[PDB]
Structure formats: structure tokens, C-alpha cells
Design a protein around this ligand. Structure first.
Ligand SMILES: *[C@@H]1O[C@H](CO)[C@@H](O[C@@H]2O[C@H](CO)[C@@H](O)[C@H](O)[C@H]2NC(C)=O)[C@H](O)[C@H]1NC(C)=O
Ligand SMILES: CC(C)CCC[C@@H](C)[C@H]1CC[C@H]2[C@@H]3CC=C4C[C@@H](O)CC[C@]4(C)[C@H]3CC[C@]12C
Ligand SMILES: CC(C)CCC[C@@H](C)[C@H]1CC[C@H]2[C@@H]3CC=C4C[C@@H](O)CC[C@]4(C)[C@H]3CC[C@]12C
Ligand SMILES: *[C@@H]1O[C@H](CO)[C@@H](O)[C@H](O)[C@H]1NC(C)=O
Ligand SMILES: [Mg+2]
Ligand SMILES: [Mg+2]
Ligand SMILES: [Mg+2]
Lengths: 291, 996, 32
């Protein structure tokens, strides 16, 4: 019943030779026209959007809060002795901070030394291309005290008591606005309120909050947050090799051999949250230093 | 060994009728005048069983529910759901925290099958319920003579061998052996098919137990006279009992529509498994594992199965079936509605189906001029001529010299369909006078009768003398009627144009040829005459005689002739003509004498003028019939006596080389043989019958058509289509609706098959190029089980693009429902454009949100990851999991909308196969509602509060609705120019490839 | 701010369109 192989009318797979040529030629012309049309429409669509600004930014309204160890489940489980147990973490930290070394930021034609103190926002004109390639403020690893990179102690951040730096989701044209007067959550962690976006970590319930002994934050000049002198972002086209601010968080007196949950919440007016997106605004981690 | 029992029931019957009155009473042991003792009744009643046919087999409620739950289409859906669960089992033991996509799809397909089964059961149950409300039969007891005393007992209490007396008006209880009759004319309509009432004579007449007159049959009504008889057969052992049991034991066969549905499923699986295997090899050749490749293969085969097409096809057939129910063309089989459209040979019955089965006055001879009376059932024919004085004389003779009139309740009923007591001829005369000469109630009494002389065996005469009416003073009127050749001899005066004239041979022979003309026309002629007895030679008061006949038997005045026959139904001739117009071969299958069958065949259209039989040519050449060549005769009359001695090969020769065939004197079993012979050629057959002799023919045939009232219950249950109004034109309506729904089925199927390309392609390239999912599963369900439901259904209300009743019936081996051309259009061209339109919207949305189309290559890896919340776009921005996932879902919803946009043009182009959309016009109000409801529902599925949380279908930025507009316009323009080239160039390529 | 979309207005317009397009279809099918 499947002997459609051949016939006396020179049939192959069902039809003749000239028939196969005619149909194949039609399908080639037809599909080629379809592909050319799709390409022409996609070209006009490419002409619709611009090069210095995405036509829609409402889907990233509340910026996120990521970390350096992109864990499989935001959990850091390792052994304080075994160096291979935390190799997957350290390698991810080194590659991340590999673009922050003093030797990486050496050209003065694209880097601008902001300052040792968090300052006001630095707006570099409009987003057009009338100006040249914008400058990017430097951010040395020395700012993240005791969780620095390769300067004196490439500690791997784990000879017990690990480090977890946090990063604000880079958004184009986003101007961070820290809080003010109505403060039912802003703890006195650090004095500097006006030119830094605060970020405070804590447990999640009555259990985690007790298990987590002490947290020490490290930032620009010692402020647990992000300096306003590094915002806003002007896109990858206008600001290549840009380095968004970083802020390290170390957990000293932890409870070894116990998995505890930490929630690092970034506070601010332009920082929204979501009960469906655990990363929008806030941040979570499940650490367990089992010896 | 039931295969032998069925053949034993197929074999013609035999009897023991030819036995002396002493031999008959010896075989059964029964008294000829006192019957049997009452105690002897319980010896045969509780021995073989009560005199009643065994009820048909019962198929309980849940059986039909399970029948519809399995089917063939539901079988494709069941295997799809099974493959879904198997793929889920292969995916569960492998991935970290799986998805519920396959699980939702499997439960959805199962629910689809169940929903369709419930809807189908509801429709098929409603049909049987109304049939049950129409089949209310009441018991009819028999008049049995037991212990020398008469007793009326239930028919089931009758046994074998007990004297039964049937009076004029009672129905023959069981098969009897006549022993003494008095002019009994039993009506063997439902059983043998003999139209004219056959008289029952105690003496053996014919070898055939049916043609003989000494046998009374079950389910036959005694028209007139009275008779006595011994019960020979009882219950199922009766003639019609064996015919009914044979009908119950026959195979229904495979319907033509189910074979098309199967062939469709065949091509569906062809593409499903072909794409699954080719993409399985491709998936492995790229970088996937066997584990993921099996999941793919199953998903490609399942996603290639039209889920929503089951409900659409079911409702599609249901709509056309409801249009038949509105016109009383009920169908018990939901798929039998199309069967008519594929029929190419209709085997009809003569008595009851084509004719009205009612002896009616056809022609009358008065003043040397034949007058054809209207032979219609609803009185819608040309009226005869009535101005002459001879019409009044004929009307008087017929209305007066006639034994009885109507009955009690026959007052509100119409003049034709009302009951009348007496012989079949007298009733016809009564209806002709009641429709043409006013009334007969006051006309019969106004002429008081004195001495009436009834029909006699010797000196056959039927006369009566009556008193004279209104002042003319001739004082007496002696009317007489009878055989034309006998009444002509006893007549001297002849009425003509009003006056009287002698019996000159010149006009006497003009009467003779008028007798043979009405005889050869297939009717029964009767001569009518009257005479005014001169009151001067014979007294005005009391002067009559009856033993030594005084009234002048001769010298009467002949008025005219009155012929009669059962006329064909009103729309029957036109119906046969319409059927022959579409290319359907009409074949008459009856059990009546050939003399009547040939005339009826020539009058309805089964035999046209000019075509001669093997007998007509021999008579036209005055030569023996064995000389003429059968190839010279276009039409032919096949005698049932010769059909018994025929082989399987000869029947084929009769059907092939002859266009107009008329099978006469064919037993029910012979009707089954003929139906099988017509099916051997490979053509679709439809049998239209009414009596129990058509049950084995209406059962075996692809579709049986029974009469709602004029059809017996057995053949009404063994059939597949019931004509509640008995209007034979319903056959023409049925064939029209069948072909119309066949074409609309092709259209609806193509519309559902076109959507699978832009449905599967997103997942295909999602695997191929490793890009974020362009279209989700929820959206796909909203497409095939959402939007596209109404358009696919409205595509069934479409109407003829040309004259469907002009083209030839479809070829089962050539013109398929879903051929390769439909696949080349849906899966090859149209669906491809819909898929490109979908991908356009996909890239548009993603690129406007920062994710340019080029940057989407290989992004799925980190896109589906729930923990990489720093996914960089083309602008350098970092997106979290839920942010890019919200974009993916708000990218899925517009893809579904894109499907709707391209489906607009797809519905418009699938609305017509050859004509242009402007030649046909979008006059399908349901199709317009199908677009408005589709668009509104789609917009609701995206802008309703809580859709991004319930079905993850986020609202769309308005500018997205215009993304697929150029593609839809392109689909429309392309298919329009395609059908235009097919219109102006009906040559090759554009007709052998696109046209589906 | 450019990080805010008036989704409520578009959603309301979509509901209004759905209602109108549906009643219009009903008028065409239930025509008199
Ligand atoms: C930076 O690193 C030094 C290690 O040289 C930390 O030294 C801590 O000194 C305090 C004060 O006595 C002790 O309580 C801690 O136990 C020491 N820590 C360790 C790891 O030895 C110092 O705290 C670190 N941080 C700062 C802000 O100086
Ligand atoms: C040969 C000629 C007629 C074809 C010309 C193609 C025209 C009709 C096509 C090419 C590109 C298309 C546009 C491409 C970009 C956009 C913006 C997008 O967000 C929605 C669709 C929209 C608004 C399209 C409308 C139709 C369009 C202008
Ligand atoms: C016969 C053919 C050409 C008619 C095509 C219908 C066009 C004019 C209609 C059909 C559906 C309509 C869209 C339906 C939904 C929306 C979203 C709503 O919130 C604003 C209007 C908007 C964006 C409509 C624009 C106009 C539209 C695309
Ligand atoms: C952890 O260490 C800090 C050091 O200041 C101490 O005050 C605190 O009580 C400790 N908590 C636990 C739970 O060990
Ligand atoms: Mg589908
Ligand atoms: Mg009949
Ligand atoms: Mg049948």
C-alpha cells in the first residue's frame, strides 16, 4: 500500500519528474517572495525604533536587585574548608569584577573620576548623538571594603563568613530617588540619605533574623547604597564599558551548618516591589555554611 | 452458523397451500366448521409463542454514549490525549520542576471528545424520541371460531390451526389458508406490493404462495367481502415475520461520509507523523537528546491534530440535519444527511412510494372524447371538462349505483384521504363525484332506490332502479355498470353531446378503441349506462320484478367509460426528472404486475418517450422477441419470474447495458439481491420504500428512505431517513443538501487546517533557533477552541457557487473530501503567510521593548531561567525573570491576535472555492457574526481585568493590532487572484494544484 | 516618567471595543 515508489508514468514519491520541477520551482519562487516580504517588513520595523532609546520602558518600572554569585536557586551552600566547594562562586565573582580592575579603567578619554564622596546626579545632556561618546565614572574595587577583589587578599571571600555584593538593574534614563520624611522602615544604618540609594538586608521571619548574627555593609565611602553620581544610564551605544555602582554585604556571625534566608530590600521612591517578582526591588538568598 | 440462517431467510418461501380440505385439516388436526376446543388453544399458545413478532433487539442508553465516545475522529483525539500523557510521563522523570502544558492539553482533548459525544447523543436521541411519538400502534384482535362459538380475542392469543373469520374491514391476523370466501379482496400492499386489491379464493390458483388466492397474509387488511381460513403460520413464522427478522439481521455497512472522515484522519496523521519524524531527525542532528527528541516528536504529532474540528464537523452536520427536520426529512443517523449527495443510483418502490396506493378515477369516456381527471393527492391538477349533459348522466350512474359511502368520523377529513367502506372502485367513483359533481350524500337519497341487483357470477350485471327527481316526469331511472365489453352488448342507445343516437358500428368501434387505449395506459375501465323506463307502458307506482327479470336488460343507453388506477404522487414525476438531471440513475423495484409497472414508469419519468423495450421493438416490427438485439433497446422490463433463474454475472449485464430498468414482480429478497447488484458496481445506492417488502432493501442500501405515514413500521425502523410528509420531493432536497454540505465541509476543514501552521511554527523555531517562545499553549487553545469555532461553523451556512443539481455525483475513488490540494493550500501557502505574520508581530514587540530580533538568537537558554535576573537586551538594560516573562506573555497574546487577523482573510478566501468573493458575496450573516464575535472575543481575552494573572494574557498596546494587517490583506489578494486565474484559465496547473 | 504606561485607559478602550463589536455582531445576526 506504500508502493507509490514508481509507476509506468514516471512517478517518484507520488508524481512525475516535470511535475516535481514545476511544483518545486513554484514553492521556491513563492517562499522566496514570502521571505523577501517578511524581511522588508522587518526592515521598516527596524527603521521605526531609534538607536539611543527604547520605545518602551514601562515593563522595567521597578528596577531589580541582582547578586554576584548567580546561584542555581539563590542558595550558597559550601564547606569552609574544601576550596572546590565554593569554586563555582569565586569564579563567578572574579569574572564579574574582572572589568572593574584599575588596569581595565585606564583610558582617560572614556573614564571620569567621580569622587570619594557620593554626589548629585550627573546628567550628560540629552540622549541624542549630537554630543560625542559619553564618559563613564570609575568605580574601583577598593570601595567595597573587606570584600574587595585582587588587591591584597584574593580571599575568595570564604575562609568562613562569606560576602555577597548587590547590584541595581541597569536601566536607561533611570534617575534613582532615595526616600525622605515618611520613614517607617528607613533604619539609621548610615547618615547619608540625599545622594545614595539605600539597601538594607535582613532575615525573613522570626527564625532567620535570629540565626543571622551580624551584617556589615561596604560601599562608596562606607555608605550602604548606590551613589547618585553614576546615574542615569545612557544606553550601551552611548556608554559602552559602563560600570554600574556596587555595594557589598558581609555576614559575619552566622550559624554554621544551618540554612538561613536573607532578604535584601532596596528602598526608594522610584523603587517598586512585587509579590510575584521576588527580584523587583528586593532580593533573596539562602545561605548555609556547613562545616 | 448465523451466516447460513441469514441465507435461509434470504431464500424464497414455500408452502403447503395446495392441499385438499381433508388434507389441510389432517396436517394440523382442526375442524373445518367448529375450529378447535378452547383447551386445545393453551396447547399451542404456550408451546411456540403468542401470535406476535419478537420485538427488535434493545441497545441500552449508555451504549450510544460509549459509541459516540469512541468513533473514529474521537479515536484520533483519544490517541492524541494518550500521547500527551505519555509525553508528560517522559518529561516528569527528567526535568527539574516540569510544566503543566501537556497535562492541560491532554485533559482538554479528552473533554472535547466527551463534549462532542454528549452533543451527538442529544441530537440522535431527539430523533428517536420524535420517531417514538409517531409510532403509536394499537392492538387489533381477531375473530376466531372456537368450540362452534364465535369469540373475538387478542391477536397474540391466536394459535396455529384454528378457524378464523375475517370480515370486510378487519386486518388479517396471521397467515391463513382460505377455505370459504364471498368476494374477499385482501390488500397485499405492504407485503407483496400488488397495488390493485387481490381477491381471495378458497381454491388453489398459482404455485407461488404469494400470487395464489387461497392464502391470507399477516399485516394485510381485508378491503371487502368476508372469508374463512385455517391458521398456517404464526408469530415470526409468518411471511412478513420472516421478512422483518431478515431485515433485523442485515448489515448496515460503511456510510460514504464516514469513509471520507477516515480518509481525512489518514492524511492528518500523514503530515503529523511525517513532520514529527523529520523534525525528530533534525532535532537530534542539531543538539538535542533522545529524551527531549521524543517529547518533540509527540508534541509535533499532537499539535498537528485538529482538536476543534470534531465539534465543528458535528455541529456542521447537525445544522443541515435540522434543516431536514424542519421540512419533515428526519434522519436517524447524524451522518446519513450527506449520503443523498453522493448517491448515483436510486432504487425505488412503485406501490406506496411512487404511487399513492389508492385506486383513483383517472380517465372517463363521454361524447367520444377521453377526459383525464386530475390524479393528484392535494387536488392541484388541471380540471376536466364538465358542461355537457353526458357528464351529468355519468355522474348519476356512478354516484347512485354504488353500494356504500363514507364512514362516521369522515366529516372533517379531506375528500381523498378519508376512509370509505366498500370496494376500491366504488371509493374512487365516490371521490370523483364528490370533487367534480358536488356531493353524493343528498344525491343518493334524492333518487330513492327500490330494487337493487348486485353483481352476479353468472350473467354478470350490477344494476339498480331508482325513482325520478325534479319535474321532467320520465318516472324511472335504471342504472347499470360493469365490464365495457359486456355493457356495450346490452345497449342500443348512445348519449352524445346531450341527445341520443343509435348504436351504429361507426361510433361503437370508437368506443372499442377508447377501451383498449385506457387499458394499455395501465388502468381498469368500467362501462356505465342508464335507461328511462317509459311510464306509459310500465306503471308509475309499483311495478318491478326480481326472479323473472322484467326490467329490460338490453336496449339500455350507454353513457361512457370510467377508468381508474393508483396514481403517482404529485411531486414524484418532477422529482424523478430532477434526479435524472443531476445524473442519478432511477431504477424501479416493485412487486406489482409488469403491465402496471411499465405504465407508471413511463408516467413518472423512469421510462422516457422514444425509448423502447425488447418487447416494444418486436411488437413494432411484428417479429418474435428472440430476434431483436438487446443493445437496440435502451430500456427494459425485468420480470421477477426470470430473475429467480439469474446468476450474479447476468444481473451486472442488465444494469450496465440498460439505462432505464424496471424490475417487476420482485419478492423482498429479490429486492435485496438487486440492491447488492447495484452496489457491486461500486456506486452509491439509495432505496425508497414503504412496505415491509422494502425493509431488506432499505436496510442493506447505503440509505433507506421510508414514508412517515404510508410506510410500514418495519421498513420505517430499518431505514435511515424518514419522510414525515411523504413528499417525494424531499429526495431532491436531500441530494441538494448532501452535496452542499459536502462542499462546505471541504471549506470548513481547510479553514481549520490552515491555522495549524502559525500554531506549530512558533514552537518549531523556538526549538530550532533557540529564541523565546513566540506563542504559548493557552493562546493556541484560545484559537482552535476559541475564535475559530464560529467561523468554521458559519462556513456550513454557505450556499452553492454554481448549480449543484447539474453536476454528476461525486466519485468515491476520485473526488475525495480532503485531497492533497487542500493540504498544499492550507499547510503549504496560506498557513505559511499566517506564520510569517505571527513572527512579524513577535519581533516587532520584542524589538520595541529593547530586545532587537537579532539579539533574540540563542537567548532562550537564559530566557527560561528563573534565576538569571540580569538578562541584557540590545540596549544594555538588565531584565529580571518576571519582567522578560511578562514581555513573553504579552508577546504570546498578540501572536494569538495575529492569528485572528490572518483568520479574517482566511475565512473570506475559504468561503469560496472557484468564484470570487464579490461574485458570491458575503451574504452569510452567520459568517459576518463569526468575524465580529471572533474579534471581540480576542480583544476581551487580552483587555479583561485579571487575564495576565489567570491565563497570562496581558493587554496589548493598540499599535499591535495593525501588525498583521498587511499580511491578511496579502492573503486575500493572493487567493483572490488565484481563484480568478482558475476562473479565466480552467486549464491545468492552476486547477490541478490549488483547487481543493 | 517614561517608566509608566496608562494601561487602564487602553484596557478600558479594549473592553469598550469588545462590547461594541459584540452587540454589532448580534445586530447583524439578529437582524430585522
Ligand atoms: C577588614 O578585615 C579585618 C581583618 O584584617 C577585620 O578584622 C576584624 O577586627 C575586629 C576588631 O577586633 C574583630 O572583631 C574581627 O573578628 C576581625 N575580623 C577578622 C575576619 O579577622 C575587619 O573587621 C574587616 N572590616 C573592617 C571594616 O575593618
Ligand atoms: C508593495 C507595498 C504595497 C507594500 C508596502 C508595505 C507596507 C504596507 C507595510 C511595510 C512595513 C509596515 C509597517 C511596519 C511597522 C509598523 C509599526 C508596527 O508597530 C505595527 C505595523 C506597522 C504600522 C506596519 C504597517 C504596514 C507597513 C507600512
Ligand atoms: C474589513 C476590515 C478592513 C475591518 C478591519 C477592522 C479594523 C478597522 C479594526 C478591527 C479591530 C480594531 C482594533 C480592536 C482593538 C483595539 C484595542 C483598543 O483598546 C483600541 C482600538 C483597537 C486598536 C482597534 C483598532 C481598529 C481595528 C484593528
Ligand atoms: C552574633 O554575633 C554578634 C556579635 O556582635 C553578637 O552580638 C550576637 O549576639 C550573635 N548572635 C548569635 C545568634 O549568635
Ligand atoms: Mg490546532
Ligand atoms: Mg410499497
Ligand atoms: Mg442503512
Amino acid at each position: 500500500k506504500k508502493f507509490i515508489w514508481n509507476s509506468e508514468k514516471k512517478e517518484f514519491l507520488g508524481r512525475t519528474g516535470g511535475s516535481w520541477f514545476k511544483i518545486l520551482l513554484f514553492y521556491v519562487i513563492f517562499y522566496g517572495c514570502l521571505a523577501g516580504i517578511f524581511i522588508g517588513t522587518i526592515q521598516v520595523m527596524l527603521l521605526t525604533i531609534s538607536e539611543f532609546k527604547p520605545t518602551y520602558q514601562d515593563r522595567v518600572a521597578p528596577p531589580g536587585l541582582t547578586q554576584i554569585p548567580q546561584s542555581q536557586k539563590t542558595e550558597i551552600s559550601f564547606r569552609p574548608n574544601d576550596p572546590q566547594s565554593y569554586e563555582s562562586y569565586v569564579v563567578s565573582i572574579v569574572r564579574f569584577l574582572e572589568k572593574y580592575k584599575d588596569l581595565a579603567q585606564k583610558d582617560d578619554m572614556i573614564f571620569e573620576d567621580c569622587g570619594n564622596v557620593p554626589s548629585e546626579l550627573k546628567e550628560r545632556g540629552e540622549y541624542n548623538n549630537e554630543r560625542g561618546e559619553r564618559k563613564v565614572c570609575r568605580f574601583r574595587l577598593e570601595w567595597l571594603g573587606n570584600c574587595s577583589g585582587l588587591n591584597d587578599e584574593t580571599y575568595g571571600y570564604k575562609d568562613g563568613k562569606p560576602c555577597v555584593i548587590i547590584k541595581l538593574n541597569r536601566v536607561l534614563g533611570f534617575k534613582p530617588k532615595p526616600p525622605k520624611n515618611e520613614s517607617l522602615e528607613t533604619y539609621p544604618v548610615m547618615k547619608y540619605n540625599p545622594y545614595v540609594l539605600p539597601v538594607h538586608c535582613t532575615g525573613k521571619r522570626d527564625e532567620d533574623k535570629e540565626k543571622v548574627g551580624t551584617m556589615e555593609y561596604f560601599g562608596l565611602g562606607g555608605y550602604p547604597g548606590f551613589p547618585l553620581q553614576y546615574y542615569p544610564y545612557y544606553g550601551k551605544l552611548l556608554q559602552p564599558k559602563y560600570l554600574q555602582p556596587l555595594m557589598a554585604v558581609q555576614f559575619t556571625n552566622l550559624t554554621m551548618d544551618t540554612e538561613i534566608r536573607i532578604e535584601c530590600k532596596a528602598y526608594g521612591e522610584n523603587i517598586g516591589y512585587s509579590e510575584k517578582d521576588r527580584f523587583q526591588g528586593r532580593f533573596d538568598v539562602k545561605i548555609e555554611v556547613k562545616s | 452458523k448465523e451466516r447460513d440462517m441469514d441465507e435461509l431467510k434470504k431464500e424464497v418461501s414455500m408452502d403447503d397451500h395446495k392441499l385438499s380440505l381433508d388434507e389441510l385439516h389432517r396436517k394440523y388436526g382442526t375442524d373445518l366448521s367448529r375450529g378447535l376446543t378452547p383447551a386445545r388453544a393453551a396447547e399451542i399458545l404456550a408451546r411456540d409463542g403468542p401470535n406476535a413478532l419478537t420485538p427488535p433487539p434493545t441497545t441500552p442508553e449508555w451504549v450510544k454514549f460509549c459509541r459516540q465516545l469512541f468513533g473514529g475522529f474521537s479515536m484520533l483525539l483519544w490517541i492524541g490525549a494518550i500521547l500527551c500523557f505519555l509525553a508528560y510521563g517522559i518529561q516528569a522523570a527528567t526535568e527539574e520542576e516540569p510544566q503543566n502544558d501537556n497535562l492541560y492539553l491532554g485533559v482538554v482533548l479528552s473533554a472535547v471528545v466527551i463534549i462532542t459525544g454528549c452533543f451527538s447523543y442529544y441530537q440522535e436521541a431527539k430523533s428517536s424520541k420524535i420517531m417514538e411519538s409517531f409510532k403509536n400502534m394499537v392492538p387489533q384482535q381477531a375473530l376466531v371460531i372456537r368450540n362452534g362459538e364465535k369469540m373475538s380475542i387478542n391477536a397474540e392469543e391466536v394459535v396455529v390451526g384454528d378457524l378464523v373469520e375475517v370480515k370486510g374491514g378487519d386486518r388479517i391476523p396471521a397467515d391463513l389458508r382460505i377455505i370459504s370466501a364471498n368476494g374477499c379482496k385482501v390488500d397485499n400492499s405492504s407485503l407483496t406490493g400488488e397495488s390493485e386489491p387481490q381477491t381471495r379464493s378458497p381454491d388453489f390458483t398459482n404455485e407461488n404462495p404469494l400470487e395464489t388466492r387461497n392464502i391470507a397474509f399477516f399485516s394485510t387488511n381485508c378491503v371487502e367481502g368476508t372469508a374463512r381460513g385455517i391458521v398456517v403460520y404464526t408469530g415470526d413464522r409468518t411471511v412478513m415475520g420472516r421478512i422483518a427478522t431478515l431485515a433485523s439481521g442485515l448489515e448496515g455497512g460503511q456510510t460514504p461520509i464516514a469513509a471520507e472522515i477516515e480518509h481525512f484522519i489518514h492524511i492528518i496523521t500523514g503530515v503529523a507523523v511525517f513532520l514529527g519524524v523529520s523534525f525528530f531527525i533534525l532535532s537530534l542532528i542539531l543538539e538535542y537528546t533522545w529524551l527531549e527528541a521524543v517529547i518533540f516528536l509527540i508534541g509535533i504529532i499532537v499539535a498537528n491534530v485538529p482538536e476543534g474540528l470534531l465539534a465543528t464537523v458535528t455541529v456542521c452536520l447537525t445544522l443541515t440535519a435540522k434543516r431536514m427536520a424542519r421540512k419533515n426529512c428526519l434522519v436517524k443517523n447524524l451522518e446519513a444527511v450527506e449520503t443523498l449527495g453522493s448517491t448515483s443510483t436510486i432504487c425505488s418502490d412503485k406501490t406506496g412510494t411512487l404511487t399513492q396506493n389508492r385506486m383513483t378515477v383517472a380517465h372517463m369516456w363521454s361524447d367520444n372524447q377521453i377526459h383525464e381527471a386530475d390524479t393528484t393527492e392535494n387536488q392541484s391538477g388541471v380540471s376536466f371538462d364538465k358542461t355537457s349533459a353526458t357528464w351529468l348522466a355519468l355522474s348519476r350512474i356512478a354516484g347512485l349505483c354504488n353500494r356504500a359511502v363514507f364512514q362516521a368520523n369522515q366529516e372533517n377529513l379531506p375528500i381523498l384521504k378519508r376512509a370509505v367502506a366498500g370496494d376500491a372502485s366504488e371509493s374512487a367513483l365516490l371521490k370523483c363525484i364528490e370533487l367534480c359533481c358536488g356531493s353524493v350524500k343528498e344525491m343518493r337519497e334524492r333518487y330513492t332506490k327500490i330494487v337493487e341487483i348486485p353483481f352476479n357470477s353468472t350473467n354478470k350485471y350490477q344494476l339498480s332502479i331508482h325513482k325520478n327527481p325534479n319535474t321532467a316526469e320520465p318516472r324511472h331511472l335504471l342504472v347499470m355498470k360493469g365490464a365495457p365489453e359486456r355493457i356495450l352488448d346490452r345497449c342500443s342507445s348512445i348519449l352524445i353531446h346531450g341527445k341520443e343516437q343509435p348504436l351504429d358500428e361507426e361510433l361503437k368501434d370508437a368506443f372499442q378503441n377508447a377501451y383498449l387505449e385506457l387499458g394499455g395506459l395501465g388502468e381498469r375501465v368500467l362501462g356505465f349506462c342508464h335507461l328511462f323506463l317509459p311510464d306509459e307502458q310500465f306503471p308509475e307506482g309499483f311495478q318491478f320484478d326480481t326472479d323473472d327479470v322484467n326490467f329490460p336488460l338490453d336496449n339500455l343507453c350507454f353513457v361512457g367509460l370510467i377508468s381508474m388506477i393508483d396514481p403517482p404522487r404529485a411531486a414524484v414525476p418532477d422529482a424523478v426528472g430532477k434526479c435524472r438531471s443531476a445524473g442519478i440513475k432511477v431504477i424501479m423495484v416493485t412487486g406489482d404486475h409488469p403491465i402496471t409497472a411499465k405504465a407508471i414508469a413511463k408516467g413518472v419519468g423512469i421510462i422516457s418517450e422514444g425509448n423502447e423495450t425488447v418487447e416494444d421493438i418486436a411488437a413494432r416490427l411484428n417479429i418474435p422477441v428472440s430476434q431483436v438485439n438487446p443493445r437496440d433497446a435502451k430500456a427494459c422490463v425485468v420480470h421477477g419470474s426470470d430473475l429467480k433463474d439469474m446468476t450474479s454475472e447476468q444481473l451486472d449485464d442488465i444494469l450496465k447495458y440498460h439505462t432505464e430498468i424496471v424490475f417487476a414482480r420482485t419478492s423482498p429478497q429479490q429486492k435485496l439481491i438487486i440492491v447488492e447488484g447495484c452496489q457491486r458496481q461500486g456506486a452509491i445506492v439509495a432505496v425508497t420504500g414503504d412496505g415491509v417488502n422494502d425493509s431488506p432493501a432499505s436496510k442493506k442500501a447505503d440509505i433507506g428512505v421510508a414514508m412517515g405515514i404510508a410506510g410500514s413500521d418495519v421498513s420505517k425502523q430499518a431505514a435511515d431517513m424518514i419522510l414525515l410528509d411523504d413528499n417525494f420531493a424531499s429526495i431532491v432536497t436531500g441530494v441538494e443538501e448532501g452535496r452542499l454540505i459536502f462542499d462546505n465541509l471541504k471549506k470548513s476543514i481547510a479553514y481549520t487546517l490552515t491555522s495549524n501552521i502559525p500554531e506549530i511554527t512558533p514552537f518549531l523555531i523556538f526549538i530550532i533557533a533557540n529564541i523565546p517562545l513566540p506563542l504559548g499553549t493557552v493562546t493556541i487553545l484560545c484559537i482552535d477552541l476559541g475564535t475559530d469555532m464560529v467561523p468554521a461553523i458559519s462556513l456550513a451556512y454557505e450556499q452553492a457557487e454554481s448549480d449543484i443539481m447539474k453536476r454528476q455525483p461525486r466519485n468515491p475513488k476520485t473526488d475525495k473530501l480532503v485531497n492533497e490540494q487542500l493540504i498544499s493550500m492550507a499547510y503549504g501557502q496560506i498557513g505559511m503567510i499566517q506564520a510569517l505574520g505571527g513572527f512579524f508581530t513577535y519581533f516587532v514587540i520584542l524589538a520595541e521593548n529593547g530586545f532587537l530580533p537579532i539579539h533574540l538568537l540563542g537567548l532562550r537558554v537564559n530566557w527560561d531561567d528563573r534565576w538569571i535576573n540580569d538578562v541584557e537586551d540590545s540596549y544594555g538594560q538588565q531584565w529580571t525573570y518576571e519582567q522578560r516573562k511578562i514581555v513573553e506573555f504579552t508577546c504570546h497574546t498578540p501572536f494569538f491576535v495575529t492569528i485572528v487577523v490572518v483568520q479574517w482573510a482566511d475565512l473570506v478566501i475559504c468561503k469560496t472555492r472557484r468564484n470570487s468573493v464579490f461574485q458570491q458575496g458575503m451574504k452569510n450573516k452567520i459568517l459576518i457574526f463569526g468575524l465580529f464575535e471572533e474579534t471581540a472575543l480576542a480583544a476581551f481575552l487580552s483587555y479583561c481585568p485579571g487575564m495576565g494573572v489567570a491565563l497570562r494574557m496581558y493587554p496589548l498596546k493598540p499599535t499591535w493590532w495593525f501588525c498583521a494587517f498587511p499580511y491578511s490583506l496579502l492573503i486575500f489578494v493572493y487567493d483572490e487572484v488565484r481563484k480568478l486565474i482558475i476562473r479565466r484559465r480552467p486549464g491545468g496547473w492552476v486547477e490541478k494544484e490549488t483547487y481543493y | 516618567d517614561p517608566f509608566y504606561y496608562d494601561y487602564e485607559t487602553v484596557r478600558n478602550g479594549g473592553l469598550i471595543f469588545a462590547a461594541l463589536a459584540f452587540i454589532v455582531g448580534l445586530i447583524i445576526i439578529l437582524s430585522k
